Design a protein around this ligand. Structure first.
Ligand SMILES: CCCCCCCCCCCCCCCCCC(=O)OC[C@H](COP(=O)(O)OCCN)OC(=O)CCCCCCCCCCCCCCCCC
Ligand SMILES: CCCCCCCCCCCCCCCCCC(=O)OC[C@H](COP(=O)(O)OCCN)OC(=O)CCCCCCCCCCCCCCCCC
Ligand SMILES: CCCCCCCCCCCCCCCCCC(=O)OC[C@H](COP(=O)(O)OCCN)OC(=O)CCCCCCCCCCCCCCCCC
Ligand SMILES: CCCCCCCCCCCCCCCCCC(=O)OC[C@H](COP(=O)(O)OCCN)OC(=O)CCCCCCCCCCCCCCCCC
Ligand SMILES: CCCCCCCCCCCCCCCCCCCC
Ligand SMILES: CCCCCCCCCCCCCCCCCCCC
Lengths: 100, 504, 55, 480
């Protein structure tokens, strides 16, 4: 009784909001937060699609998605801590040394 | 069976020149001399045993000798060599110029001399492979293979008085011109092979089988344009000529590198063998454009040659105008104009070789190429100004030299085909006399315009003088008795002409 | 009038255009990660819009 | 489906690389020994190559709903394993200069090779996504392995952020595709369509977002801006792996996805990929024109060469030998990139610490490293598509495939980009032999030198005589 279009539109809205947060925020922590919003939105879209078809593959894709989300959040926060302890500054525009 | 050895003896000789540098610093020149002499001797033996004067025209294909061996059987690509009269004349000419290039690099004994001789031999073997290959991929492979040793000779062994970045710029311009034109030719080759594959069903790159491929007029015109662009870069045809005087000016200052790589004209042979037979209708439709490009090349090259203050650039633009004459000859349908084109190619090779060797000797005597810094050199040198007078007279189109024979047979046949273009081209001969006399007046006659010209200079060695006199004798004999060359190229030229005019 | 080769120059002008286009394209490599994310999102918009237009 | 013992035979390189990961990790847990753990890693990868021989002695079959093993998968597994072995060999002297722990490097290289093997056999959207992530996360570690250096930390942060964003794009596209088509296997993407309804808007949008993720991974325009910064900032063996193995594996799974999907022969996707290939060729060559840094130059070179590969992919659903062209080009590109990045790695090894400079300074390399200069100029000629090199054979295959499919815009793009490449590759190769004013002794450095020399010899020999490589690639065909 819940349309597939509505669930996919909700997932698309969350994905777009996470991408906007990734773009407009200069702090690296908020960039990681936007990345987490984007990957959670894509996982929600997989769950919506799997629930529409009555298949378990959507939740399996969700499980792989959140495995990726956990591991890359760990890596990104480790790199954030390294940047903080090497520069005392989380500005992502300051770490821009290599240029064309 | 001797054609693979005609290609392989330069490569093995270059490898042995590189390797035998450890045995002595003045060793690899003898190895290069021996291998170029072996290549010339094998070419002359193929000439003597071929019986080209008694051969009658029987239609394409008609090879005096042939060799085939599968190379990439997936695409139907094979090492497929063949020789007839035109290819034989070109192979003898490049063997002779290779011997002259080895002798011109004598008494230049530095470190990594063996690699210089390796690059020279690989250029010569690539030129021979261009003249011998009769399948499309092997022809393209030899066409592009010469450019790497040529690039490194210009960039690393080039004109030592330059900035160093000018040599790299000239070599890069040459390489980009020739390799991009080659890639356009490769696209045309691949499209022709695919048209044949769709028409018949079998992969082939063989030139004999790719003849009479049924295709529409537009597709044939496009394939002809790709082939013509590749040949027009190396002919040179204006405006694609600009690499040539920069490559000549920044070449290694012995002058041997010019004779080895820049002086010979594989593009006129390429037009004759792969443009008229493969696309006869397209060449027939393209003929007015090509002939007007030849006229523009004649006059533009003469005007550019007059305006130079450097001798090497003057000789380069002289080459541009002569190749304009040859390009006019090719797109007519005359056996007489084709024979004149063959004689003019050989005569241009001999006369440009003499001019470039004499310019190198003059530069190593006076340490400048600016004609504003030299003058009155007839009274200061022993042999060089008189031989330079002879070779400027030869490039002028003087009867008694083979340049006259080639140019006037071109003009006779072209007047039988296209009279207006012939009239304009003979006025181009007047302009040729103008620039030859301008060079002679600025360089050797008058008062000395600098302190370096107001001194007695050492005479030429016996080796340089004897090879220049050999070129003089060859040009005079070609002017007075050109009949053996005509009888050699007659059957192949007749085959090309009868294929070109009977299919239109 | 011809002493500096005009045909050589009008064949040299593709090299001038290539150098100018390369210098212009190198302005996108400014080293800013937010611009790299923004360019990825711009490319996503362009690809999706092209696919919707072409259908 | 269940896993029969024959299916276990077909998973042999994957099993051997996973077992090597476990064994190397337990050896690190025993004692931190650089030589033993590097040796165990390279032994595991060589055992995976011999297991590829054993897989070839078996059949070609679908080992899971997820994996399909065939000659295609075997060829890409071999390419990934060769790239990983070369990366470990180049890494040992560089890590010998390193000061911190230097065995987690080999663990991460093994896990990235495992992801490359999974992408080589990937027949499913789940296996594609998992293989991309198994490639990506160890590369997050490897690019910032020398994180005390500013450039490596910068490249690590850029690569991590952008690859997480691209994985989000790819996953959202996969979710939209799964919303349209009820199956996640490659052969069922667009299967439930007909009568000219192949261009379903949701399916095209999902493939567009997947194209965004994969084109980030392949450095295709306009998802290419990360490439020179990450290539310059990463350690040089990491740059070798990132240039060869990641690109080869991801392009192989893209090739199989476009071969098997019924939406692969879509006009809209073909036109979009043609635009991306044109822009990639022209932009990579134009941006590499004025580069004095060799690693940035090779990054832009990778952009243009992946553009040529994409041109070969566009003609896949029309012609036949596009797979053969991709195989030959990928072999040549692998060997050329291994030689070039290995020369860059050998002259930058041992590691000089985070404080010292790491510029290559290739001018006048011949007068103190003549063999490496010869290898580097052979590789520069090969990346330029010069005849007598295998790079020309790949370029000839790309041109023939484009001419057969009447892709005239892409053919002209290849010609123009090749001319621009001629300029900058020749600039590097001739700067190798000039004169520079100013500015080892172990068998692992010699092993790296032997690797770059064998790559140069393979490039020259297979450029002169390319029939064995063509014959090898032609018998490595997937299930039709
Ligand atoms: C970085 C910036 C700078 C670098 C990039 C610059 C641009 C590079 C690209 C330039 C070339 C563009 C494409 C030229 C080919 C166009 C092909 C074409 O229009 O084909 C249409 C048609 C095909 O044939 P079709 O009609 O199908 O045949 C069946 C029945 N006739 O064709 C025909 O019917 C025949 C058409 C013949 C005339 C068109 C070809 C013109 C070629 C121009 C160059 C040569 C000019 C003459 C020679 C000058 C000296 C070399
Ligand atoms: C010399 C030319 C250039 C070579 C470059 C190679 C680059 C890629 C390397 C890996 C390529 C693997 C390609 C394998 C394709 C096999 C396709 C196939 O169907 O093979 C089947 C065949 C057995 O035949 P069949 O009877 O058909 O089997 C079915 C029976 N149920 O079974 C086979 O064919 C088995 C194949 C086994 C391959 C083992 C490879 C071991 C590793 C060799 C590395 C050499 C060094 C290279 C690096 C040098 C240094 C950088
Ligand atoms: C910058 C350099 C590179 C320039 C870009 C690359 C070349 C562009 C060529 C454009 C060609 C346009 C063709 C337009 C029609 C296409 C559709 C068609 O009907 O093609 C005709 C034909 C296939 O139709 P079919 O019924 O099978 O006929 C077989 C017999 N021809 O088609 C065929 O049979 C094959 C057609 C081949 C077309 C020519 C390919 C060779 C190109 C030569 C060099 C480029 C053109 C000249 C130089 C321009 C300036 C650089
Ligand atoms: C007559 C029309 C019909 C026939 C057309 C035939 C086309 C193929 C044959 C002609 C090709 C012409 C190429 C002209 C440029 C040659 C390269 C050159 O001049 O390089 C030298 C120059 C470096 O020297 P410099 O300027 O001092 O240094 C600046 C950097 N520090 O280098 C540079 O400045 C940068 C060089 C960049 C790379 C070279 C340019 C490539 C451009 C595309 C090539 C294909 C063109 C296709 C046709 C276009 C229209 C004619
Ligand atoms: C066919 C292979 C082409 C690419 C390899 C080129 C390198 C070959 C081996 C090295 C030779 C270098 C010679 C350098 C001579 C420099 C002389 C400078 C002063 C004149
Ligand atoms: C900045 C670099 C730009 C490079 C552009 C290269 C363009 C090459 C020429 C392409 C010509 C394509 C012609 C296609 C004609 C198709 C006609 C089909 C009729 C059915």
């Amino acid at each position: 009784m819940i349309p597939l279009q509505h669930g996919l539109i909700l997932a698309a809205i969350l994905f777009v909001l996470g991408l906007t947060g990734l773009v407009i925020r200069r702090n690296l922590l908020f960039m990681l937060i936007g990345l987490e919003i984007m990957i959670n939105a894509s996982a929600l879209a997989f769950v919506v699609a799997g629930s529409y078809w009555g298949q378990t593959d959507g939740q399996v894709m969700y499980i792989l998605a959140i495995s990726l989300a956990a591991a890359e959040a760990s890596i990104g926060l480790a790199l954030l801590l390294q940047l903080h302890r090497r520069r005392q500054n989380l500005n992502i525009d300051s770490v821009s040394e290599m240029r064309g | 069976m001797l054609l693979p050895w005609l290609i392989l003896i330069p490569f093995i000789g270059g490898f042995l020149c590189w390797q035998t540098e450890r045995f002595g610093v003045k060793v690899p020149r003898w190895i290069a001399l021996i291998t170029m002499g072996l290549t010339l001797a094998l070419s002359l033996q193929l000439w003597l045993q071929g019986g080209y004067s008694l051969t009658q025209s029987a239609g394409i294909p008609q090879w005096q000798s042939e060799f085939d061996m599968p190379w990439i059987p997936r695409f139907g690509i094979s090492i497929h060599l063949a020789i007839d009269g035109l290819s034989l004349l070109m192979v003898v000419l490049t063997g002779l110029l290779g011997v002259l290039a080895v002798l011109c690099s004598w008494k230049e004994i530095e470190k990594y001399q063996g690699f210089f001789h390796l690059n020279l031999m690989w250029i010569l073997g690539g030129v021979i492979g261009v003249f011998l290959a009769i399948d499309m991929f092997l022809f393209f492979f030899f066409w592009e293979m010469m450019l790497v040793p040529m690039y490194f000779l210009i960039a690393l062994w080039g004109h030592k008085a330059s900035d160093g970045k000018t040599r790299i710029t000239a070599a890069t311009k040459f390489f980009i011109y020739t390799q991009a034109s080659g890639l356009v030719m490769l696209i045309a080759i691949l499209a022709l092979v695919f048209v044949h594959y769709n028409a018949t069903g079998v992969w082939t790159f063989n030139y004999e089988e790719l003849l009479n491929t049924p295709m529409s007029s537009g597709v044939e015109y496009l394939l002809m344009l790709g082939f013509f662009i590749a040949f027009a870069v190396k002919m040179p045809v204006v405006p694609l000529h600009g690499w040539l005087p920069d490559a000549h000016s920044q070449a290694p200052t012995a002058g041997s590198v010019d004779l080895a790589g820049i002086l010979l004209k594989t593009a006129a042979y390429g037009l004759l063998r792969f443009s008229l037979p493969l696309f006869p209708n397209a060449s027939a439709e393209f003929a007015p454009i090509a002939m007007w490009l030849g006229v523009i090349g004649i006059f533009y090259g003469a005007w550019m040659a007059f305006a130079q203050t450097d001798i090497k650039r003057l000789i380069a633009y002289t080459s541009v105008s002569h190749m304009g004459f040859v390009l006019i000859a090719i797109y007519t349908g005359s056996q007489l104009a084709y024979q004149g084109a063959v004689i003019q190619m050989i005569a241009h090779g001999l006369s440009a070789a003499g001019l470039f060797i004499l310019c190198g000797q003059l530069y190593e005597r006076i340490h400048t190429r600016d004609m504003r810094m030299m003058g009155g050199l007839w009274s200061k040198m022993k042999w060089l100004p008189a031989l330079s007078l002879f070779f400027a007279v030869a490039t002028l189109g003087m009867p008694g030299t083979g340049n006259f024979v080639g140019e006037f047979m071109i003009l006779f046949g072209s007047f039988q085909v296209v009279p207006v273009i012939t009239v304009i081209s003979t006025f181009g001969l007047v302009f040729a006399s103008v620039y030859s006399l301008a060079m002679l007046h600025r360089a050797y006659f008058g008062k000395a315009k600098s302190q370096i010209a107001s001194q007695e200079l050492p005479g030429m060695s016996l080796r340089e003088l004897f090879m220049i006199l050999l070129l003089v004798v060859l040009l005079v004999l070609l002017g007075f008795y050109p009949q053996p060359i005509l009888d050699t190229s007659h059957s192949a030229i007749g085959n090309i002409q009868q294929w070109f005019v009977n299919s239109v | 009038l011809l002493k500096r080769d005009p045909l050589n120059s009008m064949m040299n002008i593709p090299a001038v255009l290539s150098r100018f286009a390369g210098k212009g394209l190198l302005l996108s490599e400014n080293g800013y990660l937010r611009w790299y994310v923004a360019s990825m999102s711009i490319g996503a918009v362009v690809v999706l819009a092209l696919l919707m237009v072409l259908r | 489906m269940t896993i029969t013992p024959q299916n276990l035979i077909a998973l042999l390189p994957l099993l051997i690389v996973g077992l090597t990961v476990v064994v190397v990790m337990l050896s690190i847990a025993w004692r931190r020994n650089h030589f033993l753990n590097a040796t165990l890693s390279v032994i595991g990868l060589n055992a995976a190559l011999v297991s590829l021989w054993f897989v070839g002695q078996a059949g070609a079959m679908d080992v899971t709903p997820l994996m399909r093993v065939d000659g295609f998968a075997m060829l890409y597994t071999g390419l990934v394993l060769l790239a990983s072995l070369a990366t470990c060999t180049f890494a040992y002297p560089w890590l010998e200069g390193y000061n911190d722990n230097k065995d987690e490097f080999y663990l991460l290289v093994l896990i990235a090779a495992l992801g490359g093997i999974l992408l080589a056999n990937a027949n499913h959207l789940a296996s594609l996504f998992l293989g991309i992530e198994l490639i990506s996360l160890p590369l997050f570690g490897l690019v910032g392995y020398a994180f005390r250096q500013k450039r490596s930390l910068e490249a690590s942060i850029k690569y991590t952020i952008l690859s997480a964003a691209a994985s989000s794009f790819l996953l959202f596209g996969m979710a939209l595709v799964y919303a349209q088509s009820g199956d996640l296997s490659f052969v069922a993407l667009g299967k439930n369509l007909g009568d000219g309804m192949l261009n379903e808007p949701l399916l095209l949008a999902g493939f567009g977002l997947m194209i965004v993720g994969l084109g980030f991974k392949l450095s295709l325009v306009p998802f290419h801006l990360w490439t020179p910064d990450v290539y310059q900032g990463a350690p040089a063996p990491v740059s070798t792996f990132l240039a060869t193995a990641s690109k080869i594996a991801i392009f192989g799974v893209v090739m199989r996805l476009f071969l098997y999907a019924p939406v692969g022969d879509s006009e809209a996707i073909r036109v979009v990929l043609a635009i991306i290939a044109f822009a990639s060729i022209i932009f990579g060559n134009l941006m590499a024109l004025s580069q004095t840094n060799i690693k940035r130059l090779l990054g832009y070179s990778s952009i243009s060469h992946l553009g040529y590969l994409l041109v070969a992919l566009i003609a896949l659903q029309t012609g036949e030998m596009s797979m053969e062209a991709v195989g030959v080009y990928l072999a040549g590109y692998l060997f050329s990139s291994l030689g070039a990045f290995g020369v860059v790695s050998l002259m930058s090894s041992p590691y000089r610490g985070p404080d010292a400079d790491s510029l290559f300074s290739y001018r006048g390399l011949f007068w103190h490293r003549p063999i490496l200069a010869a290898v580097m100029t052979v590789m520069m000629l090969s990346l330029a598509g010069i005849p007598m090199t295998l790079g020309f054979i790949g370029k000839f295959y790309v041109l023939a495939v484009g001419v057969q499919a009447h892709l005239w815009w892409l053919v002209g793009a290849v010609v123009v980009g090749s001319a621009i490449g001629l300029y900058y590759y020749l600039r590097v190769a001739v700067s190798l032999y000039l004169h520079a004013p100013e500015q080892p002794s172990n068998w692992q450095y010699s092993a790296g030198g032997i690797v770059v020399l064998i790559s140069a010899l393979l490039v020259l020999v297979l450029g002169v005589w390319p029939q064995p490589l063509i014959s090898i690639v032609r018998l490595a065909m997937p299930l039709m």
